[model samples]
Target: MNIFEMLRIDEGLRLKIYKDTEGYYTIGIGHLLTKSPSLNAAKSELDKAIGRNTNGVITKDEAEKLFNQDVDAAVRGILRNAKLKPVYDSLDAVRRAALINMVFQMGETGVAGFTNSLRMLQQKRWDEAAVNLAKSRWYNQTPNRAKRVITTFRTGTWDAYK
Candidate 1:
């Protein structure tokens, strides 16, 4: 019953780009796009309207807010999982944030399927956990993201994926 869960259940998930009811390009959990004006044209107007650019697309600030909210909800979801909570709490800030982002990206249920990685994490075996993360289907599907996240896991540096 987290906001993330409620959002998915209520708004529905969208993996592909499509027009919203207002004919704006949108995707991913009701992320609405900017309207008729081009992104550049919309920028000034959005900045004027919202005190920041939020026109035809998600602004960095808006994205950051959404990401933090999503991660918070995901962290709550992770904490609700009995087996993973202790391990999650034991990690340092950067590692924990990385894991939180991982859970955010994959959902708690999807990430819970990473048993070997979770075991490695629980054991505080950083390198092994990084390796396990890099060897996953998730990694195969998105190598650059896996590299950056695994780098954060391995080096304890928190660099958000580009």
Candidate 2:
């Protein structure tokens, strides 16, 4: 129903370590603790979050906290972008989720690079924005997720949550 809820389903929760789409070692709702160099410290922090050592496992409650921090930061990321701030404020919650999810996947700066898509979205041109989203390398990279975001933007619906 909201950004946080929708993203939990999208990113998924994995207590144990697993490879992401790009093969980064991740855990607990897209926490990219790819165990390379000092990045493994983040992985260690994950274990500490739950206050227990389950051999690389995190509790639902712990992952939920991380999810909130990540999602809330994504919202702030959108607010920090001057160009997108007004556009985001003008939209309804449904539309906001689409942009928020975009920021979540690709940071605010990455989403900002979509000049045409941002233009269409800012102008409330839902169809054009959706079309432009489909044309991106992001779409090709993870089509299923992109399509869901596109449909939300185009239709102002949250059917993807189901």
Provide the clashing-pair count of each candidate structure: 1, 0
| Candidate 1 ranges with C-alpha deviation above 4 Å | 1-68, 159-162
Model 2 per-residue lDDT tens digits across residues 20-40: 787666778876664554435
lDDT score, candidate 1, position 21 = 48
The C-alpha local distance difference test score for the whole of candidate 2 amounts to 0.81
Candidate 2 has a TM-score of 0.87
Q: Candidate 2: list runs displaced more than 4 Å.
A: 34-55
Per-residue lDDT over 131-153 for candidate 1, one digit per residue giving the tens place of the 0 to 100 score: 88887888887676667668767
Query: Residue 111 deviation, candidate 1, in Å?
Result: 0.9
- Global Cα RMSD, each model: 10.5, 2.4
Best by TM-score: 2
Cα deviation of 72, candidate 1, in Å: 2.0
Which numbered prediction scores highest in lDDT against the true structure?
2
